[PDB]
Amino acid sequence: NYISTRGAGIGERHTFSDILLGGLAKDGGLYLPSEYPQVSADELARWRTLPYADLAFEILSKFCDDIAAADLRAITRRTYTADVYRHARRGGNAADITPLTTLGTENGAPVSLLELSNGPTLAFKDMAMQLLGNLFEYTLAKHGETLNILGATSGDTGSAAEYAMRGKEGVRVFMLSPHKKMSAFQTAQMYSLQDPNIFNLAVNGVFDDCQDIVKAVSNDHAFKAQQKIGTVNSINWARVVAQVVYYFKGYFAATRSNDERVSFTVPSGNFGNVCAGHIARMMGLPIEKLVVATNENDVLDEFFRTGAYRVASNFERFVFDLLGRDPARVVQLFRDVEQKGGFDLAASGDFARVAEFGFVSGRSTHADRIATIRDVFERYRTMIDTHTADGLKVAREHLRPGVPMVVLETAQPIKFGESIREALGQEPSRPAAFDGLEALPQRFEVVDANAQQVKDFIAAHTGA
Numbered sequence: 488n489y490i491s492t493r494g495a496g497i498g499e500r501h502t503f504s505d506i507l508l509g510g511l512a513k514d515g516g517l518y519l520p521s522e523y524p525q526v527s528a529d530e531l532a533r534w535r536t537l538p539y540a541d542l543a544f545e546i547l548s549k550f551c552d553d554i555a556a557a558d559l560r561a562i563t564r565r566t567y568t569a570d571v572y573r574h575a576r577r578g579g580n581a582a583d584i585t586p587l588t589t590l591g592t593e594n595g596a597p598v599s600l601l602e603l604s605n606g607p608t609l610a611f612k613d614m615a616m617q618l619l620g621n622l623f624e625y626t627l628a629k630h631g632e633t634l635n636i637l638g639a640t641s642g643d644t645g646s647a648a649e650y651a652m653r654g655k656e657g658v659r660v661f662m663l664s665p666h667k668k669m670s671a672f673q674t675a676q677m678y679s680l681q682d683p684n685i686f687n688l689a690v691n692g693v694f695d696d697c698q699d700i701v702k703a704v705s706n707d708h709a710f711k712a713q714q715k716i717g718t719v720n721s722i723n724w725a726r727v728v729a730q731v732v733y734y735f736k737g738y739f740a741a742t743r744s745n746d747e748r749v750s751f752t753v754p755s756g757n758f759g760n761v762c763a764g765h766i767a768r769m770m771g772l773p774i775e776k777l778v779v780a781t782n783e784n785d786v787l788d789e790f791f792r793t794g795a796y797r798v799a800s801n802f803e804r805f806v807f808d809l810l811g812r813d814p815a816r817v818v819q820l821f822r823d824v825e826q827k828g829g830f831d832l833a834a835s836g837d838f839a840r841v842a843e844f845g846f847v848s849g850r851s852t853h854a855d856r857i858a859t860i861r862d863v864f865e866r867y868r869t870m871i872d873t874h875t876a877d878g879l880k881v882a883r884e885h886l887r888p889g890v891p892m893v894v895l896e897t898a899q900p901i902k903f904g905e906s907i908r909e910a911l912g913q914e915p916s917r918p919a920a921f922d923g924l925e926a927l928p929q930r931f932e933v934v935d936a937n938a939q940q941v942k943d944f945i946a947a948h949t950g951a
Contacts, residue, residue: 489724491516492807494814503551507626508634509723516814517804518724524549526771528745535739539584540567542739543618543732549770550728554625562621571617574605574920576899577869581605585614585733587740587893590867595888600875600896601737601751608676610898611760612647615729620651620658622725627657634717635949637704637941639663639697642673643902648719653682661686661945663697666933671925672901678929686948692936703938710942714951721759721800730763731770738772741891745773749891752778752882754874756787756848758801760895765805765844775890779848780881782856791848794838797829806832809840849881853906856880860910870900870907870915 489506490496493516506518526534526549534545543563548556569581579586579602589599606613627634634657638648645662652658664677666689678687690697704716719726734751741749753760756779768774781787790796803817809832810816816837823830832838851859859876863869871879878894886892900907900915907915934940 488521489518490521490814492519492803492814492817494818502553503725504553504626507622507725509718509720509725511722516817517722517800517807519804519807520550523766523769531745531771534735535745538582539732539736540564542735543567543729546732546735547618547728558625562625563618566618566621571607572605572613574609574899575602576605576916577602579605583736583740585736587737588869590863593883593892594886596750596886596890596892597741598879598882598886598892598894599737599741600871601733601740601893602896603733604896604899604902606647607650608643608646609902610643610647611895612644613650614733615723615726616647616651616719618651618729619719619723619725620655623652623658624655631657633657633659633715633949635714635945635951636660636717636719637663637701637945638719639694639701640669640677641665641694642669642677643898644720646673646676649677649680649685649687652719653680653685655684659684659686659949661688661941661948663688663690663700663934663941665689665694665697666691668693670902670904672904675925675927675929678931679924679927681930686944687931688941688944689931689933690936691933696936700936700938700941704942707942714945714949716945727759727763727766727801727804730759731767734764734767734774735772737893738767738774741893747891748773748775749893750774750776750778750882750885750887752780752878752885752892752894754780754878754895754897756781756784756791757897758799758805760897761846762801762804765808765846768845769808774845775887776847776885777845778881778885779846780851780877781848782851782877783853788848788850791841791846794832794841795829796824798824808844809837811837811840847885849884851877851880857906857910860906864911870911871896872898872900872903873906874898874903876906 489501491512493514495512495514540563544560547559567584572584573581575581577588586602587599603611652660738749764777807817820830856873856876859880863871874897882892882894904915
């Protein structure tokens with residue numbers, strides 16, 4: 488049973504499928520399960536040797552009792568294949584889906600990269616998005632209807648969304664991107680798509696103008712009903728579930744037996760990965776530390792260091808757990824933010840739950856990340872990107888002799904080429920598979936920063 492971070496859902500029934508499409512709860516909160524499903528010692532032992540798709544089935548099954556088991560297995564097996572997750576760049580077996588690449592021992596701990604970025608758009612959101620494509624298609628087939636997804640992107644999330652949803656029955660994607668303001672690789676991956684259910688709208692503004700238009704359409708309830716408007720952003724619970732799976736996969740790959748403990752480092756203070764790692768640990772996965780790298784973001788640093796915020800969907804899910812899963816406390820925190828200019832979890836006695844849950848944090852600077860990229864290229868003979876470098880720098884501050892440390896690789900170097908050029912004096916390396924991408928014919932519709940222009944476009948391209 489799924490309930491709201493702000494109190495709705497008690498005395499009701501919301502299944503996984505009921506909330507799949509990712510709406511907020513009725514009270515403005517986010518949906519969460521009423522308990523975290525527990526993995527027994529026997530289950531954990533049985534799961535160690537499962538291929539990724541079957542491990543995914545096991546975990547998704549804990550969170551979804553309303554979809555027939557056979558159908559969930561068919562969905563995960565269709566989703567997680569070597570062919571889709573084909574871009575393994577370090578000699579790994581793509582059938583692992585998220586191969587673990589061990590770098591070496593540091594402070595007595597084996598340090599590895601978990602390769603989450605071998606999917607079609609070379610970054611970690613392909614892990615959840617590919618699954619959401621199949622889940623959406625499956626669920627929408629039951630009603631013979633179409634979901635018209637509206638989203639915004641600066642390149643990476645929209646790419647992952649479009650590669651997951653292209654060609655899915657019952658789905659269209661209307662994606663707003665800032666015209667001429669994205670990197671060439673990301674622009675080409677999106678705009679080269681010819682699929683008739685994918686609509687790339689290049690907005691004459693910046694990313695925040697694109698987000699503002701999605702928000703404005705969010706507030707037009709009659710239009711949302713008329714056009715069956717959907718979202719695949721962080722409000723989506725299924726995306727978090729999907730991410731729990733690779734913590735299990737990485738744990739097993741990093742260990743020989745379930746007597747061992749593993750630490751993970753999450754780049755970029757990303758609350759979806761924070762949440763997913765925390766949820767895996769809460770289910771019984773033997774995670775020692777969850778290390779959160781926050782680069783030079785002072786807000787994130789301040790929160791993890793002190794529990795305070797002075798004035799993210801998934802921040803709210805995390806803080807709900809810090810506050811004891813009491814929705815009244817969450818509502819108060821948001822009242823403190825609005826009425827009193829921030830919150831202070833240390834003062835209220837709730838900050839102790841951050842360390843309780845295994846969390847620690849650290850920061851990196853641009854110079855630190857360049858140095859880390861250069862170090863890795865020389866010592867371990869491989870390219871890593873800026874996000875992975877933020878992760879590795881921070882990971883290195885939290886090594887315990889004897890405890891594997893797994894750093895999430897959240898984007899491949901080709902996605903963030905500027906820092907690779909600065910660090911390594913060259914473009915990211917790329918195989919023949921990607922030759923000509925940026926020169927392919929591009930298909931997009933330019934629109935101004937005008938919400939009604941976007942509404943008109945959607946209405947003219949759905950048949951509603």
